[PDB]
Design a protein around this ligand. Structure first.
Ligand code: CLA
Ligand code: CLA
Ligand SMILES: C=Cc1c(C)c2cc3nc(c4c5[nH]c(cc6nc(cc1[nH]2)C(C)=C6CC)c(C)c5C(=O)[C@@H]4C(=O)OC)[C@@H](CCC(=O)OC/C=C(\C)CCC[C@H](C)CCC[C@H](C)CCCC(C)C)[C@@H]3C
Ligand SMILES: CC(C)=CCC/C(C)=C/CC/C(C)=C/CC/C(C)=C/CC/C(C)=C/CC/C(C)=C/CC/C(C)=C/CC/C(C)=C/CC/C(C)=C/CC1=CC(=O)C(C)=C(C)C1=O
Ligand SMILES: CCCCCCCCCCCCCCCCCC(=O)OC[C@H](CO[C@@H]1O[C@H](CO)[C@H](O)[C@H](O)[C@H]1O)OC(=O)CCCCCCCCCCCCCCCCC
Ligand SMILES: CCCCCCCCCCCCCCCCCC(=O)OC[C@H](CO[C@@H]1O[C@H](CO)[C@H](O)[C@H](O)[C@H]1O)OC(=O)CCCCCCCCCCCCCCCCC
Ligand SMILES: CCCCCCCCCCCCCCCC(=O)OC[C@H](COP(=O)(O)OC[C@@H](O)CO)OC(=O)CCCCCCCCCCCCCCC
Ligand SMILES: CCCCCCCCCCCCCCCC(=O)OC[C@H](COP(=O)(O)OC[C@@H](O)CO)OC(=O)CCCCCCCCCCCCCCC
Ligand SMILES: CCCCCCCCCCCCCCCC(=O)OC[C@H](COP(=O)(O)OC[C@@H](O)CO)OC(=O)CCCCCCCCCCCCCCC
Ligand SMILES: CCCCCCCCCCCCCCCC(=O)OC[C@H](COP(=O)(O)OC[C@@H](O)CO)OC(=O)CCCCCCCCCCCCCCC
Ligand SMILES: CC1=C(/C=C/C(C)=C/C=C/C(C)=C/C=C/C=C(C)/C=C/C=C(C)/C=C/C2=C(C)CCCC2(C)C)C(C)(C)CCC1
Ligand SMILES: CC1=C(/C=C/C(C)=C/C=C/C(C)=C/C=C/C=C(C)/C=C/C=C(C)/C=C/C2=C(C)CCCC2(C)C)C(C)(C)CCC1
Lengths: 74, 480, 38, 28, 337, 32, 71, 27, 31, 27, 38, 28
């Protein structure tokens, strides 16, 4: 299927013109609404240093690491 | 004519000469084994198996013999230390002579097979051209390998007929050869259980016997026969090299991380034991238990064996040597002679201080003395640098508990500085560097050298596998 | 005794090969002797 | 005496270069 | 013997799958594609997602992502903390226990990228073999490509396995790779190692050969089958100028192939040597001579002093798990010498 | 015997088997 | 070249083994068994690797130097 | 440093001599 | 309509445009 | 004894190599 | 420049000559080194 | 270290003898 025919097709143009902005705004909202911070766990600029911990985190655990990160996080 | 790098390709389609060259290589290997064992015995010093074990003398081939029960020497001396019973026929010199004799016999066999290369055995009965039935040859050889594996598992290691194998306590204090009872539960799969080795060898031998019998009784399929091209012999070489470097990787890993097949009694401690404070934790727990019994601090510390304290020394760490720092470990920092004692540092006020042990990854770590809380209180400043918390200003003092210098105390700034620098490395020891003119730089125990060499060969053999597989798959275009 | 071996061949290498080999050995030597002596 | 060994190696290498330059094997 | 040499026999489903896979399409799927396209794809994703959203605030105590305000150079995918040791960091493993957010926080994404990328490299060189077989050509490309696989395995897999854990492996990122380079310089004295010397010689010689061959071929073209460029003219020119010139085209192109592969293989052997801390770090004779005679001083002594400075001034923050605090009087300085 | 890690390993194993089966079924269906 | 090789008692004893080189079965043979056993061996190797790595913890398994004293 | 001297001497002598013998045979 | 080329291009592109939108919005975030 | 070693080494290297060069040229 | 030299000749020596020469140099060496070292 | 030098000279001489025996030039 040569590229020229698909490029000149009207159906292609309309469907891509309606979908591309949808994905663009989807990403915009996904980052601006803060869902990215929660899903990927990156702290926002105002909770890097919780009041209990004023230094950088440190793990010191291999198996029992989950609640360790819970304590370090938040 | 052929290039310099193809001279050995003549034997590809000449089975007799192939047999001859393989015998000759086996002869070289056995002769190396014998000669290295003889030199090994000629150089070894069994005077002090406590603070001068075999692994500190650059003993590479002897530990493998020691692992499988051979402990007695014809010279009377024994690895355990005593003179023991009569050596018997099976001794280190015995194994060396046996390997040399075997190498010579294989040399004669190789010469015989070289002279007589044309044999009806290799010729196809149907057609005059020479042919080799690779699947069936594999069948016989796998059958033999399975039989040998089952025999080793059920007779030698098990102790039913043989002596068994080496086993030692977790902390490598007392260890020697015994029979091993096979373990069939899940506990037999952990790396640190000899019964795992016994059960493994038995089961692997049985399954190898079954697989060899099958490959003997059944012939390949046409689709497989032409896809894998088992007609040619090159594919066999490629697959063999693949399995070989897999084995090399596995063996190197098992050596480096430590397993029941490499006891620290005769291979040296592993670096991860020093990193995680294995022996340090052991000594601390034992001394704490002794103190709880009511004995005084000096009395409690005096109970610790010299061997256990020696294992907690940075010098005994394979990850500290140098690529070109050749020689035995003793050539690096002398031969250990006695243990001075656990050195405790206390400041003028009374608080106890502890030197920050050098991490295994550094080479010149500055010395710091830490308080129980974890705050730096004293430290030797950089050379000819400004001083604020040096030894003199704080005036720390050192007292030795246990060992040779038990009870003695010192307050001289130079002496305490030197002893703090020493304790940085772990437990302090007295070394007679004059005997071998020790250069003062650490070397790598046999474990590190074995791992290095075998991993390098593993990579090279991966490349060899790729090359020979490439030639095999592309035979037609390569030929012309 | 067996008949003469059919697949007998001889090895050859021209002057370029000799120069390459000698240069390789000498370069490796000058590179590694510094560490061998230590 | 290591110095003499080093100079020997360097001079030998230079000799190999010289021979490769001036004494080339004519093609075929 | 029982049947013919696999001409037709029966059209089993395997034959149909093979025919579909090896179709002459825009993209050659092939069998190796089943192993290459998925894994490699994930690897790329595993990096880009890793560079974009997740953070390294817990493994290394650093901010390495666009979300936290990092340039393209600074952003990176950080290795798991040293506590994780040599765990493979399976998302379903005990460390993460199926919690994706905590799996990302612990740094398992680095392990994801590394493992899937290694398998992608395997699939890629299998693809090279497959296409070479399909076109009836010698697979010298696979032999050439074996070198980068060797370097990747020796740097990203063998080295951390030889060290305490994954923590000391390179972290995917430009600034991270620069940190790794300076880290080897400071601790292992990697520049002094003979194997690195041989590898750098190979690499620079490869670049030299590329440039010279391009210039020579482009400057001996015939006026306008037969070879476009005059080989005799080029041979005469480079024999007059340099002294030695190539006489056989096949040998020349094979030499171009041979140089870089050997260089990188030797460098990989050197990195394997470092993985066990077998480092060509010191000359005993020079060190003792400098010790006995304070006046004596060479460039090597200055390099050793610089390495000491690097270690002392970087270990404070490069290895947080050690909890290292250095009093200001302890850090090396030039004037204190 | 029923430790959670074994459960997770078996889950991963069945997931990989599912992936392989899906790929094989897709290849067979698309081919013919 | 047509003359066969030297005749030996061991040689004639061992002729039956190296006698039908090239003989092959029709069809796919037992390749399904190869699928099954390759997969089983892969599972076994994965079990061992996760046992040694400690990524798979078992109640009986201790996976440490302290287990030498045990049994 | 005797080990270094002997190792270096062997590495110079045995392989270069090896090559020279082959080349002499070729011509 | 569902060719492998289509699948490849879409699988590459869709995350690409999604991430470009995410990044451009991400740049305007007040620090 | 450095002088003896260097003299011996020179006497083994220069003349034997000299002969080898000529022989290589002849063939 | 002068015309090509008419009396230009090339030196040759066969394998026997090489063996004689090498054996002479090595024999002289083994004989005299014992005194050179002293 | 003179012993190694003497041994090298001796074994070198024996090598020359061996080559003169087995690797003779066929005359003319
Ligand atoms: C089981 C191991 C094994 C076996 C049986 C073979 C057998 C063969 N190989 Mg393969 N090969 C192997 C491993 C093996 N190889 C590995 C590991 C590599 C990667 C390094 C290669 C790379 C390789 C290449 C690139 C080529 C071959 C070729 C060949 C054929 C001719 C041998 C040759 O090169 O001329 C004889 C070679 C020499 C006389 C030179 C030896 C000098 C060496 C390099 C230095 C001395 C080393 C030392 C004395 C011994 C080290 C021992 C160490 C292993 C512990 C022959 C069929 C050639 C071939 O088939 O082409 C048609 C070919 O081109 N091999
Ligand atoms: C062919 C492509 C391919 C390959 C080679 C890999 C390979 C890998 N992946 Mg990736 N992955 C893939 C596709 C692939 N994956 C796809 C398509 C996805 C999206 C769904 C993922 C998503 C993914 C994640 C999210 C993770 C991995 C991880 C891993 C690693 C561990 C896998 C493991 O141990 O599981 C177990 C392995 C197997 C099941 C392999 C087969 C073993 C045999 C065949 C089992 C035989 C059992 C039995 C006989 C059959 C079942 C019978 C039963 C029905 C009764 C490994 C490097 C993990 C990792 O290490 O990351 C750090 C991880 O976290 N992958
Ligand atoms: C840093 C230098 C460097 C790079 C980036 C590079 C890259 C490449 N070389 C290739 C080929 C080659 N390279 C060759 C020789 C060499 N290549 C060299 C150095 C390099 N080669 C050197 C020095 C040599 C001499 C030996 C050969 C002989 C070939 C080829 O045949 C091949 C080709 O055809 O080129 C056009 C391509 C392989 C495609 C691929 O990975 O398949 C897809 C596989 C994937 C995606 C899996 C790998 C995943 C990786 C390992 C995980 C990390 C991914 C992150 C994005 C990493 C980011 C890191 C940050 C620091 C930025 C690719 C374009
Ligand atoms: C007292 C004194 C003497 C002081 C010396 C001090 C001192 C420091 C000495 C240097 C020490 C030293 C030698 C160190 C280097 C050691 C070192 C690291 C060696 C690496 C060795 C090694 C085995 C590494 C393996 C890697 C390897 C394979 C590298 C190869 C490098 C190499 C040879 C590259 C090629 C270089 C080169 C100049 C090629 C040009 C080729 C050329 C003439 C092409 C022209 C040409 C082009 C055409 O296109 C066509 C068509 C034709 C026809 C043609 O002709
Ligand atoms: C060329 C080859 C190309 C093909 C291969 C491509 C890559 C394949 C995919 C990656 C495989 C990753 C394997 C993980 C191994 C692992 O997790 O080890 C982790 C464990 C070790 O685990 C460690 O043990 C130590 C000892 O007590 C400490 O306790 C550590 O805390 C503990 O983490 O080792 C293994 O299980 C594997 C051993 C066998 C394989 C060894 C590989 C090579 C070793 C090199 C040694 C240094 C040199
Ligand atoms: C070339 C020969 C090797 C260098 C020898 C240098 C030397 O003088 O050694 C000197 C050493 C001996 O060194 C001496 O030992 C004595 C023992 O009583 C004392 O300790 C002396 O102090 C010490 O000088 O010789 C050797 O140990 C030879 C070792 C041979 C190599 C074995 C390990 C190989 C591992 C790597 C394999 C993979 C390599 C892949 C490469 C591609
Ligand atoms: C204990 C027993 C002894 C053990 C040791 C045995 C050693 C055996 C001999 C090994 C060496 C063989 C050498 C062959 C040498 C040789 O003649 O090879 C020739 C070969 C090409 O030859 P051809 O195949 O074209 O020749 C066809 C026929 O005519 C035969 O030559 O080149 C190579 O394959 C690579 C050569 C080495 C690499 C060359 C380039 C890189 C090195 C140069 C670096 C210079 C420095 C640059 C940076 C500063
Ligand atoms: C006015 C300019 C003066 C320049 C002087 C410098 C000249 C350098 C000549 C290098 C020749 C290397 C030996 C070639 C041996 C030889 O005979 O090669 C011959 C070879 C040509 O081979 P053919 O094409 O005839 O091969 C045909 C095939 O069938 C194989 O026979 O030359 C090359 O391919 C290029 C090699 C460049 C390699 C450059 C390496 C440079 C290393 C320098 C090391 C210095 C160490 C210093 C220590 C202090
Ligand atoms: C069939 C696959 C279906 C899609 C799986 C999900 C993929 C998307 C992942 C997004 C993150 C979700 C976070 C939960 C992550 C998660 O799924 O954990 C689920 C589970 C652990 O969860 P728990 O046991 O704690 O949960 C208990 C219940 O609430 C059920 O979750 O782990 C597994 O049993 C295996 C999961 C494998 C999932 C990865 C599939 C790929 C395996 C590797 C295949 C290699 C094949 C190689 C062939 C040669
Ligand atoms: C500083 C610059 C360098 C200075 C040094 C230069 C050195 C030049 C080379 C000198 C050596 C030349 C050697 C030529 C060697 C050579 O090839 O000669 C060959 C020559 C006979 O050759 P033809 O004349 O028959 O050959 C004709 C043509 O084919 C060319 O050979 O024999 C002699 O004249 C005597 C040779 C030495 C004496 C041989 C017998 C006695 C010594 C052997 C003793 C063995 C031990 C027995 C007792 C244990
Ligand atoms: C005949 C006989 C006999 C005897 C015998 C003998 C005595 C033998 C010996 C033998 C021997 C005595 C052998 C040896 C061998 C050795 C070897 C085989 C070695 C090898 C080596 C190698 C291979 C190396 C390598 C290397 C090096 C050098 C280092 C590093 C690098 C490399 C790896 C390269 C008698 C009379 C009794 C009787 C009859 C039989
Ligand atoms: C992890 C994960 C996964 C997967 C993932 C993936 C698959 C991803 C992908 C991803 C992707 C696929 C991404 C992409 C991205 C892209 C980007 C990010 C781009 C960018 C670009 C740019 C930035 C550009 C720029 C430029 C240009 C070139 C043009 C103009 C100029 C400039 C320079 C501006 C899994 C399933 C395993 C699990 C879950 C999670």
């Amino acid at each position: 299927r040569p590229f020229s025919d698909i490029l000149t097709s009207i159906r292609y143009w309309v469907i891509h013109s309606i979908t591309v902005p949808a994905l663009f705004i989807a990403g915009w909202l996904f980052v601006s609404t803060g869902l990215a911070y929660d899903v990927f766990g990156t702290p926002r600029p105002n909770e890097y240093f919780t009041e209990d911990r004023q230094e950088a985190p440190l793990i010191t655990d291999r198996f029992n690491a989950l609640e360790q990160v819970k304590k370090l996080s938040g | 004519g052929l290039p310099w790098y193809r001279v050995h390709t003549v034997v590809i389609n000449d089975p007799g000469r192939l047999i001859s060259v393989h015998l000759m290589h086996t002869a070289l290997v056995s002769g190396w084994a014998g000669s290295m064992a003889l030199f090994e015995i000629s150089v070894f010093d069994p005077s002090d198996p406590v603070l001068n074990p075999m692994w500190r003398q650059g003993m590479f081939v002897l530990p493998f013999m020691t692992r499988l029960g051979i402990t007695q020497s014809w010279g009377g001396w024994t690895i355990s230390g005593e003179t023991a019973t009569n050596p018997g026929i099976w001794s280190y010199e015995g194994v060396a002579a046996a390997h040399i004799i075997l190498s010579g016999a294989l040399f004669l066999a190789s010469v015989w097979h070289w002279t007589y290369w044309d044999l009806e055995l290799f010729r196809d009965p149907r057609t005059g051209k020479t042919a080799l039935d690779l699947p069936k040859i594999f069948g016989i050889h796998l059958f033999l390998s399975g039989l040998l594996c089952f025999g080793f598992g059920a007779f030698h290691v098990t102790g039913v007929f043989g002596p068994g194998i080496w086993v030692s306590d977790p902390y490598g204090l007392t260890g020697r050869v015994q029979p091993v009872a096979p373990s069939w539960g899940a506990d037999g799969f952990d790396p640190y259980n000899p019964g795992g080795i016994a059960s493994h060898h038995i089961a692997a031998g049985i399954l190898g016997v079954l697989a060899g019998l099958f490959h003997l009784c059944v012939r390949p399929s046409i689709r497989l026969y032409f896809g894998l091209s088992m007609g040619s012999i090159e594919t066999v070489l490629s697959s063999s090299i693949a399995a070989v470097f897999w084995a090399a990787f596995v063996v190197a890993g098992t050596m480096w991380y430590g397993s029941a097949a490499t006891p620290i009694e005769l291979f040296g401690p592993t670096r991860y034991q020093w990193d995680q404070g294995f022996f340090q934790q052991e000594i601390q727990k034992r001394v704490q238990a002794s103190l709880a019994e009511g004995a005084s601090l000096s009395d409690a510390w005096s109970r610790i064996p010299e061997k256990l304290a020696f294992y907690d020394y940075i010098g005994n760490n394979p990850a500290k040597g140098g690529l070109f720092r050749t020689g035995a470990m003793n050539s690096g920092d002398g031969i250990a002679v006695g243990w001075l004692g656990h050195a405790s540092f206390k400041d003028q006020e009374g608080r106890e201080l502890f030197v920050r042990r050098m991490p295994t990854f550094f080479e010149t770590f500055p010395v710091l003395l830490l308080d129980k809380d974890g705050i730096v209180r004293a430290d030797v400043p950089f050379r000819k640098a400004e001083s604020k918390y040096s030894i003199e200003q704080v005036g720390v003092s050192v007292t030795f508990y246990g060992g040779e210098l038990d009870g003695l105390t010192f307050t001289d700034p130079a002496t305490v500085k030197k002893y703090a620098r020493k304790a940085q490395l772990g437990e302090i020891f007295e070394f007679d560097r004059s005997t071998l003119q020790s250069d003062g730089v650490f070397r790598s125990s046999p474990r590190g050298w074995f791992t290095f060499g075998h991993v390098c060969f593993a990579l090279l053999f991966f490349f060899g596998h790729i090359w020979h597989g490439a030639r095999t798959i592309f035979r037609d275009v390569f030929a012309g | 005794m067996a008949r003469p071996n059919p697949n007998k061949q001889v090895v050859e290498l021209n002057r370029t090969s000799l120069y390459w080999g000698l240069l390789l050995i000498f370069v490796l030597a000058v590179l590694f002797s510094s560490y061998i002596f230590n | 005496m290591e110095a003499l060994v080093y100079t020997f190696l360097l001079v030998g290498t230079l000799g190999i270069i010289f021979f490769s330059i001036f004494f080339r094997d004519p093609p075929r | 013997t029982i049947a013919i040499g696999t001409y037709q026999e029966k059209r089993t489903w395997f034959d149909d799958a093979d025919d579909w896979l090896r179709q002459d399409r825009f993209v050659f799927v092939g069998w190796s594609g089943l192993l290459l396209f998925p894994c490699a794809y994930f690897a790329l994703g595993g990096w880009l997602t890793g560079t974009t959203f997740v953070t390294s605030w817990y493994t290394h105590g650093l901010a390495t992502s666009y979300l936290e305000g990092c340039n393209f150079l600074t952003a990176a995918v950080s290795t798991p903390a040293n506590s994780m040791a040599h765990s493979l960091l399976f998302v379903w493993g005990p460390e993460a226990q199926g919690d994706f957010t905590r799996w990302c926080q612990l740094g398992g994404l680095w392990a994801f990228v590394a493992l899937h990328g290694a398998f992608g490299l395997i699939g890629f060189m299998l693809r090279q073999f497959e296409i070479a077989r399909s076109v009836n050509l010698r697979p010298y490309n696979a032999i050439a490509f074996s070198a980068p696989i060797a370097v990747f395995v020796s740097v990203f897999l063998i080295y951390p396995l030889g060290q305490s854990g994954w923590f000391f492996a390179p972290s995917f990122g430009v600034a991270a790779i620069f940190r790794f380079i300076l880290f080897f310089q400071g601790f292992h004295n990697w520049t002094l190692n003979p194997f690195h010397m041989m590898g750098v010689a190979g690499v620079l010689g490869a670049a030299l050969l590329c440039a010279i061959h391009g210039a020579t071929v482009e400057n001996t073209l015939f006026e306008d089958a037969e070879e476009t460029y005059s080989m005799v003219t080029a041979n005469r020119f480079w024999s007059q100028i340099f002294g030695v010139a190539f006489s056989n085209k096949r040998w020349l192109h094979f030499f171009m192939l041979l140089v870089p592969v050997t260089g990188l293989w030797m460098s990989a052997i050197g990195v394997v040597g470092l993985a066990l801390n077998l480092r060509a770090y010191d000359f005993v004779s020079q060190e003792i001579r400098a010790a006995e005679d304070p006046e004596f001083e060479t460039f090597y002594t200055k390099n050793i002093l610089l390495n000491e400075g690097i270690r002392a001034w970087m270990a404070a923050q490069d290895q947080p798990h050690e909890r290292l605090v250095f009093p200001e009087e302890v850090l090396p300085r030039g004037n204190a010498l | 015997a029923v430790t959670p890690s074994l459960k997770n390993f078996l889950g991963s194993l069945i997931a990989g088997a599912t992936v392989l089966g899906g790929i094989a079924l897709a290849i067979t269906a698309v081919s013919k | 070249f047509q003359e066969p090789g030297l005749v030996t008692p061991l040689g004639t004893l061992l002729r039956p083994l190296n006698s039908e080189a090239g003989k092959v079965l029709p069809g796919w043979g037992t390749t399904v068994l190869m699928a099954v056993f390759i997969l089983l061996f892969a599972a076994f190797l994965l079990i061992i690797l996760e046992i040694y790595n400690s990524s798979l913890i078992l109640d009986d398994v201790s996976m440490s130097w302290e287990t030498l004293a045990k049994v | 440093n005797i080990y270094g001297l002997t190792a270096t001497a062997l590495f110079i002598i045995i392989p270069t001599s090896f090559l020279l013998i082959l080349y002499v045979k070729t011509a | 309509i569902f060719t492998v080329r289509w699948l490849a291009i879409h699988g590459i592109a869709v995350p690409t445009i999604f991430f470009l939108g995410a990044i451009t919005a991400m740049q305007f975030i007040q620090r």
